[PDB]
């Protein structure tokens, strides 16, 4: 599988512009590996800022630009405020699967909602069905991602679903652990994880796309506990 690599840690200061870098060990970081930046803020809080390359989320602030540099993809901070102390991370689609980028924890010296909720404990060997209600757009019309974290690991892409027919598809590694479903009516995507071990422990994350627009509005993450 792909390796993404980031600055692990870059510093500025308010009011300097700032770029990240997001490298693939498959060669070239190209528009077809549709990179989308996101932001983490403390406590699980993902904003997703620039989608396929250099497109911005709308209503982020236009300070944020995306862009490729040679072989990597960049993102770039033009006017560092205080609040953009973060951690931002890339991914790029690798044709059938999407990969996160180690994040980089810049330090800065000095309508669409995805409900989710916040913790759940389970024990071994059940399932669990975690679900993302959504509000402020048409949620037919817009797939549903799913990923974790587990504590101390980086993000992995589990699947998406389309709302219009319910098709799937998921990573190698949840291919045979998750089962993605919605309901139209509520607005509602749900996840179920069948066969849950301790390994499953983890803070899980629904986050919209569609074809040619990924990751662009997060829920704000369900931790799941495997006793
Ligand atoms: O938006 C694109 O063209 C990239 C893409 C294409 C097909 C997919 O199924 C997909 N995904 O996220 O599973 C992503």
């Known amino acids: 599988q792909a390796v993404v690599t980031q600055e692990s840690a870059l510093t500025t200061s308010p009011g300097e512009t700032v770029t990240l870098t997001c490298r693939s060990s498959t060669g070239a970081v190209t528009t077809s590996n549709y990179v989308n930046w996101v932001q983490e803020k403390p406590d699980h809080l993902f904003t997703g800022l620039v989608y396929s390359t250099n497109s911005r989320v709308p209503g982020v602030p236009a300070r944020f630009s995306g862009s490729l540099i040679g072989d990597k993809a960049a993102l770039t901070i033009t006017g560092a405020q205080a609040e953009d102390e973060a951690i931002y991370f890339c991914?790029?689609?690798?044709?059938?699967?999407?990969?996160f980028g180690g994040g980089t924890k810049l330090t800065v010296l000095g309508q669409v909602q995805l409900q989710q909720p916040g913790a759940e404990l389970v024990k071994p060997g059940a399932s669990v069905k975690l679900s993302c209600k959504t509000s402020?757009?048409?949620?037919?019309?817009?797939?549903m991602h799913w990923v974790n974290q587990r504590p101390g690991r980086g993000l992995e892409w589990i699947g998406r679903?389309?709302?219009?027919?319910?098709?799937?598809r998921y990573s190698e590694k949840f291919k045979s652990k998750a089962t993605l479903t919605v309901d139209k009516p509520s607005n509602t995507a749900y996840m179920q994880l069948s066969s849950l071990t301790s390994e499953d422990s983890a803070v899980y994350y629904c986050?919209?796309?569609?074809?040619?627009?990924?990751?662009?509005?997060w829920g704000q993450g369900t931790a799941l506990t495997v006793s």
């Open positions: 679903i389309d709302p219009n027919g319910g098709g799937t």
């Open positions: 986050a919209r796309g569609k074809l040619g627009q990924h990751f662009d509005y």
């Open positions: 991914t790029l689609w690798y044709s059938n699967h999407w990969v």
């Open positions: 402020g757009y048409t949620f037919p019309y817009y797939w």
